[PDB]
């Protein structure tokens, strides 16, 4: 019965198998050249920012907020939006939508520099040791007597966060669920693995490796530095301001500076107003001198939706495409690869070159964003007869950039199976335009293969 009230635990039908992700990748890409395009010398580098972007935007949304799903994630991913209400996953799955719902008509994204969409990425904190994540959702198609089922919840329900994981959204610790008087360094340290166990239980064995400091409470940083699963941290003070083109050291266990850009009291300005102003000032400097725009957010709203669209229209896919909009975990992993991986290219014969690179994350858990960009100097797309890759490469796109050649290499072990899960979702909901768009987006991440061809045929 469509009109009957149901109170359900939000659930998604698949989650990327984070626990199974391989920690070590061995990339081997073979480049075969056209006969009259024999080149004499090639050399390679991993660029400062993925996709050869010019500058970095980092976003972490605190307090495990309902709006991280209903506003932030929904706006990025082309989902139904509301001006005053807060959808849960089960509302979207059932088509039980609030009375003011609308859509932007597009996703919010950059390109990867080689012709594919890269949707904006961000992280949310998680209140994994808080039973309020187990709250149910009221679903009732066609019910208009009230809209209480769409009111803001105190925090995300697990199903919302589980679905966000399928789109690369990151996670971070924040407050832990202890009495205020028990928030000592030692007691917080003991509670981190308790929260971690729930994260792994619910997020298909993903391990959280980030702390967003709560409310200037340094006991959280001191405790987190003794819990070796946490590799990256952020705070407003007692941190390091990130300059992506200048930073030279290890950032293992480093507190990266992140600002909320609160507006002056009574000024009528919003946080997005303040961030926009900071971005404009920063872009006046040469890219090598720019700090990262590293931001925190609390509740997101219509103004934040419009700000995300402004970023898309100005520095993303519909603007100058200069920005890398990501979460701190993906950036941390990329910086680690740039520091420790050493791409090499060797001539195999007169017309064949072999590019090799190892991606090895830290010993605590598999890195979850095992993708890099490699530039080849001395080569152009027009020289190339064919490109082949080994099994560890699951996504591969490439093309000219400025006067050189770039490859975007994705090594997520279960990427093809993940794309097929989105295809199956579309096949089960073939009238859902957003489901078909998601299927095309994920299938387009895959390297050329029989499986990619199969999946493309299923979503024509
Ligand atoms: Co907070």
Author numbering: 40 to 499
List sentences quoted exactly from the publication behind this structure.
Four crystal structures of BoPDA bound to divalent cations were solved: to Co2+, Ni2+, Zn2+, and Cu2+ at 1.42 Å, 1.48 Å, 1.36 Å and 1.56 Å respectively. Co2+, Ni2+ and Zn2+ are the most common cations used by CE4 enzymes for catalysis. Our four metal-bound BoPDA crystal structures allowed us to investigate the metal-binding strategy of BoPDA given it lacks the canonical His-His-Asp triad. In the Co2+ bound BoPDA structure the divalent cation is coordinated with a His213-Asp102 dyad and four water molecules. The Co2+ ion is coordinated through typical octahedral geometry when validated using the CheckMyMetal (CMM) server, with acceptable values for all the CMM parameters. A composite omit map was generated for the BoPDA-Co2+ structure and it shows clear, defined density for the Co2+ cation and each water molecule modeled. Additionally, instead of four water molecules completing the metal binding site as in the BoPDA-Co2+ structure, there is a glycerol molecule (green, sticks) and 1 to 2 waters interacting with the Ni2+, Zn2+ or Cu2+ ion. Taken together, this suggests that the preferred metal for BoPDA is likely Co2+, and it may have reduced or no activity with Ni2+, Zn2+, or Cu2+. Through analysis of our structures, we hypothesize that Co2+ might be the catalytically relevant divalent ion for BoPDA enzymatic activity.
Here, we present structural and functional characterization of a putative polysaccharide deacetylase from Bacteroides ovatus (BoPDA) encoded in a CPS biosynthetic locus. Structural analysis of BoPDA revealed an atypical domain architecture that is unique to this enzyme, with a carbohydrate esterase 4 (CE4) superfamily catalytic domain inserted into a carbohydrate binding module (CBM). Additionally, BoPDA lacks the canonical CE4 His-His-Asp metal binding motif and our structures show it utilizes a noncanonical His-Asp dyad to bind metal ions. BoPDA is a lipoprotein unique to Bacteroides and likely has a role in the biosynthesis of capsular polysaccharides.
